[PDB]
RNA sequence: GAAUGUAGUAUGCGGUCCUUGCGGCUGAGA
């Protein structure tokens, strides 16, 4: 069940840097899955790692047709060209290839679920991508408030009038449909709504077998991070543990190639102990893992949960071919 | 996660300079 959350006003999600009296400038980051997970936990508690699992969260735009927007993959150049890693046996090294030069800049933006059903194959259309400005803007409120120095700057997320945030929740765990809850930093709220699972999901769910068998026959698999994941075993590391892919039935891995941005540093407030939660590092959303697996994948779903805190919404990954 | 105040679009500036109410007409006809 999707959870549409249309913001009445702008939203600010606190970055880890403190802001009480000294660091008056308070920037914003993209909504971490923990914040939305806590908001949904409050919502279900009012209606009646949590016992229920949140698959993840994606942006959406409602202009006649209702479509969910997924973070732009790191596998797409700014010229809408895919990047594929091919290995050079002569030099013994593997490089990422865009067929137009060894250097490229990832395309910042989004990718609709129609894009997802076509991007997993290995091609991307033009209409499948949306720029960042079409969804949200960085609205910075200034001079909000012996108070001569209390004037502090705040940057918020100014979503477009037809754009909001949708949270993906597994079937069941039903609760209140229409209502309002607070999300973010400085006290703001959204007008959330409960909507049946979109036809895009079933479009990608039904066509999962084709991509799955293509991956199985070609011996190549790509894993796309829809939401950030904490893949460390003891600490926090970006290296993909080979046992992690052993759950889906990978007998052996030949080579693993991963491209991603700077890690996201975050923490939380432990309401039970009234102390901040341990700091964590997660691989940024939109990163893709290129693996050369031996064997086959027996996963019945086109997605899997990787890492810890997967119930919140972390580690939403899609299996794709390259 | 919670947690303005003070402030005159004012200061100075001449609707002035150059232009003939002129031109033509019998207080006359028997």
Rg (CA), chain A: 20
Query: Resolution for this model in angstroms, one decimal place?
Result: 3.0
Solved using: cryo-EM
Q: Which nucleotide is nearest to A145 (CA to C1')?
A: B4
How many Cα neighbours within 13 Å face the side chain of A130?
22
Angle at A109 between CA A8 and CA A164, to 5 degrees: 15
Spatial distance from the CA of A144 to the C1' of B4 (Å)? 10
Contacts of A135 (CB under 8 A, 6+ apart): A59, A61, A69, A110, A159, A160, A163
- Asked if residues A315 and A230 have their Cβ atoms less than 8 Å apart, the reply is yes
Q: Which nucleotide is nearest to A271 (CA to C1')?
A: B1
Closest CA to A318 of A306, A297, A298, A304: A304
Spatial distance from the CA of A215 to the C1' of B14 (Å)? 95
Spatial distance from the CA of A13 to the C1' of B13 (Å)? 60
Q: Which residues fall inside 7 Å of strand B, measured at CB?
A: A 14, 19-21, 143, 148, 182, 185-187, 269
Question: Which DSSP category does A32 fall into?
Answer: P
List the structure tokens of A170.
Answer: 């597994």
Spatial distance from the CA of A130 to the C1' of B19 (Å)? 77
Spatial distance from the CA of A14 to the C1' of B3 (Å)? 15
Contacts of A51 (CB under 8 A, 6+ apart): none
Spatial distance from the CA of A42 to the C1' of B20 (Å)? 102
State the angle between helix axes of A208-218 and A199-206 in degrees (0 to 180), rounded to the nearest 10. 40
Spatial distance from the CA of A117 to the C1' of B23 (Å)? 102
- Cα–chain-centroid distance for residue A79? 22
Q: Which nucleotide is nearest to A185 (CA to C1')?
A: B1
What phi and psi, each to the nearest 5 degrees, are found at residue A244? -60, -45
Q: What is the DSSP string of A251-303?
A: EEEEEEEEE--SPEEE--EETTTTEEPPPEEEBPTT-EEEEEEEE----SSSE
Q: Which nucleotide is nearest to A152 (CA to C1')?
A: B4
Q: Which nucleotide is nearest to A14 (CA to C1')?
A: B1
The protein footprint on chain B, as nucleotides within 7 A of a CB, is 1-4
Question: Which DSSP category does A169 fall into?
Answer: E
- Enumerate the H helices of chain A as residue ranges: 33-47, 113-119, 199-206, 208-218, 242-246
């Amino acid at each position: 069940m999707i959870l549409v959350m249309k913001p009445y006003d702008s939203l600010l999600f606190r970055e880890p840097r403190p802001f009480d009296v000294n660091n008056h400038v308070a920037r914003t980051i993209l909504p971490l899955p923990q914040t939305l997970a806590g908001a949904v936990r409050s919502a279900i508690y009012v209606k009646y790692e949590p016992e229920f699992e949140i698959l993840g969260h994606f942006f959406y735009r409602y202009d006649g047709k209702f479509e969910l927007l997924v973070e732009s993959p790191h596998d797409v150049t700014q010229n809408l060209g895919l990047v594929k890693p091919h290995r050079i046996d002569k030099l013994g090294i593997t490089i990422l290839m865009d067929s137009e030069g060894i250097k490229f800049r990832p395309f910042n933006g989004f990718l609709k679920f129609s894009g997802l059903i076509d991007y997993l194959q290995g091609r991307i259309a033009e209409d499948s991508v949306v720029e960042r400005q079409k969804i949200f803007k960085k609205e910075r409120r200034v001079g909000i408030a012996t108070k001569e120095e209390h004037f502090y700057q705040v940057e918020m997320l100014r979503f477009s009038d037809d754009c909001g945030i949708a949270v993906w929740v597994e079937d069941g765990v039903d609760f209140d449909d229409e209502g309002i809850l607070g999300v973010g930093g400085e006290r703001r709220f959204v007008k959330f709504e409960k909507r049946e699972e979109p036809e895009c999901i079933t479009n990608l769910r039904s066509k999962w077998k084709k991509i799955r068998d293509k991956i199985n026959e070609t011996g190549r698999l790509k894993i796309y991070l829809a939401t950030p994941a904490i893949l460390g075993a003891k600490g926090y590391s970006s290296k993909l543990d080979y046992d992690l892919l052993g759950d889906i039935g990978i007998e052996r891995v030949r080579s693993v190639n991963f491209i991603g941005g700077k890690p996201v540093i975050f923490s939380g407030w432990d309401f039970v102990t009234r102390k901040p939660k341990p700091t964590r590092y997660a691989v940024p959303a939109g990163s893709v893992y290129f693996v050369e697996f031996e064997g086959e994948v027996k996963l019945d779903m086109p997605y899997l949960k990787l890492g810890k805190l997967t119930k919140l919404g972390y580690g939403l990954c899609f299996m794709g071919v390259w």
